[PDB]
Amino acid sequence: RLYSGNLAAFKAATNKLFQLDLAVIYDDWYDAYTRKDCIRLRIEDRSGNLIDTSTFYHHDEDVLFNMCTDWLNHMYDQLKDWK
């Protein structure tokens, strides 16, 4: 199963994004065609407009959560220069 520390890091990244006056939308499912699990994240604002949306595929959830957290930190660095 998923390790607790990875979930904690993902939650910390989500809270950091939310404190930046942004909205994080999380969706997930499984794709049997590719035999993997898929997670899509859609970033928004206080008005509810899409900014960045990306989907990740993997067969192990520990790597998937790490990739998602890395992407969230990358966007936070990008959009935290200002605004």
């Binding site: 979930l7 993902f10 939650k11 939308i25 999380y26 997930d28």
Partner: protein, 481 residues
């Protein structure tokens, strides 16, 4: 004009029997309603809730007390019908072919009086009210927005600069801190169990008429009928249609309810006293001494002198033969006001009946309710309810998106998902149906969703027995395996 055919309605909310019917079909309808009421899990839950003393001996539960209230109500209804038939007013009042439904409705209303109380009774309601009062602080919304709003919910704060949304926050905040047994009973009979009772049967259990979201003073012409909350905000629409089905004005009451109330006032005294003897607290001699000191001649002297398990069987009968005809005459004398629904008094409320009832009540308060065991049970129940609410608190701290996602299926909320799965199926289905009908675009969606989440929590907490809640409280605290 008095016509009881406009008040005894045998229609239903779903799959109602339409058309014309005879006496036999109507009687079969009401017998079917009795069949649904008697065979319900709520009655079997009443089987294991305490009345005064802890559940062990042959002490009484809620069910046996309901069985006395039912008998008294049926006897009063029969006396009223007989007295009306003697005076040749039975056919002029529209009751010629409706005596059976009359008695059945009164009996079933008396049976469903205690269907909606929470575990531990008066001390369960107090705990729920104080917990939600601490969480919401309804006294800070009575006027224009403040800067020192102590509410702990962001969406329920009164943020100055918007008056249409504020009215709704005020209503929800005031409603959520007025849990009451009868309103929960109405909600249980209609929404949670889905029994599909007739309109008259549902109206028979509407005891008080004050809305739960009421703020301020009540009109001087209804100060007795509005002393307690009557229904919640989630049933308002329902109640509206109920009035249209029974020709009731705003803040009015269904006639037969009066009779039921009367019954709940007689038994309330005498039964408790008997149990005090059975638990070896004091004895018959002390009973008479305390009664004589706290004080009449007829009942007390006959009971004390003809006696020198069979003493109480003689004491009840005299009290019934002294009280029931008085209630019947009070019902018949003020019949137009009761049929209008605006009678601002009770049937038994300066005669010797009030004195005898007060005698029984004060003796019971002095020698029974002051025992240490009752007092200890009362404190323990308060603490248990508070602890359960504290345990289930994390479900109320989530967000709209998180709770919505949790309902549809999670990997990010293990503890919350397990806590949510611990709830019952019926309550979750009720939440789903209630939330589905809401418009998903209005700015009022979060307010209603929070209201229904709190309603779900209160239904779960109030749907337990004393023993089940106690055991679950020790299990969730890791005190017992």
């Amino acid at each position: 004009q008095i016509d009881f055919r406009k008040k005894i309605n045998w229609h239903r909310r779903y799959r109602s029997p339409q058309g014309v019917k005879t006496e036999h079909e109507i009687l079969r309808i009401f017998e079917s309603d009795r069949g649904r009421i008697i065979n319900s899990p709520a009655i079997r839950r009443l089987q294991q809730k305490t009345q005064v003393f802890p559940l062990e001996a042959a002490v009484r539960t809620r069910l046996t007390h309901s069985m006395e209230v039912q008998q008294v109500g049926r006897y009063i209804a029969k006396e009223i019908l007989s007295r009306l038939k003697e005076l040749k007013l039975l056919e002029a009042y529209g009751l010629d072919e409706l005596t059976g439904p009359f008695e059945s409705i009164v009996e079933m209303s008396c049976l469903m009086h205690d269907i909606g109380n929470p575990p531990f009774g008066h001390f369960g309601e107090a705990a729920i009210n104080d917990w939600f009062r601490q969480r919401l602080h309804p006294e800070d919304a009575e006027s224009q927005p403040l800067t020192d709003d102590r509410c702990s919910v962001a969406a329920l704060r009164l943020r100055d600069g918007e008056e249409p949304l504020n009215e709704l926050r005020r209503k929800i905040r005031q409603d959520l801190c007025h849990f009451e047994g009868n309103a929960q009973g109405i909600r249980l009979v209609h929404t949670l169990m889905r029994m599909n009772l007739t309109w008259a049967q549902v109206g028979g259990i509407l005891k008080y008429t004050r809305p739960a979201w009421w703020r301020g003073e009540t009109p001087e012409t209804h100060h007795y009928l509005m002393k307690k909350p009557g229904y919640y905000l989630s049933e308002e629409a329902y109640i509206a249609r109920l009035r249209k089905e029974l020709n009731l004005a705003l803040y009015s009451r269904f006639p037969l309810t009066w009779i039921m109330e009367a019954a709940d006032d007689i038994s309330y005294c005498v039964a408790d006293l008997e149990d005090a003897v059975e638990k070896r607290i004091f004895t018959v001699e002390q009973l008479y001494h305390h009664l004589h000191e706290a004080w009449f001649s007829l009942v007390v002297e006959n009971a004390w002198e003809k006696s020198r398990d069979q003493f109480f069987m003689y004491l009840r009968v005299n009290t019934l033969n002294k009280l029931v005809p008085y209630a019947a005459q009070r019902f018949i004398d003020n019949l137009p006001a009761i049929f209008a629904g605006t009678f601002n008094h009770a049937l038994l409320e300066a005669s010797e009946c009030s004195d005898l009832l007060k005698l029984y009540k004060n003796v019971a308060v002095k020698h029974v309710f002051s025992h240490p065991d009752v007092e200890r049970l009362e404190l323990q129940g308060y603490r248990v309810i508070s602890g359960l609410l504290e345990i289930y608190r994390p479900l109320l701290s989530l967000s709209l998106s998180d709770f919505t996602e949790l309902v549809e299926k999670v990997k990010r909320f293990p503890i919350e998902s397990r806590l949510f799965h611990k709830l019952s199926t019926r309550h979750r289905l009720a939440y789903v149906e209630a939330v589905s009908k809401l418009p998903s675009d209005s700015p009022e969606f979060p307010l209603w969703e929070y209201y229904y989440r709190c309603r779900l929590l209160q239904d779960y907490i109030s749907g337990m027995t004393d023993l089940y809640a106690w055991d679950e409280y020790r299990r969730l605290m890791a005190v017992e395996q």
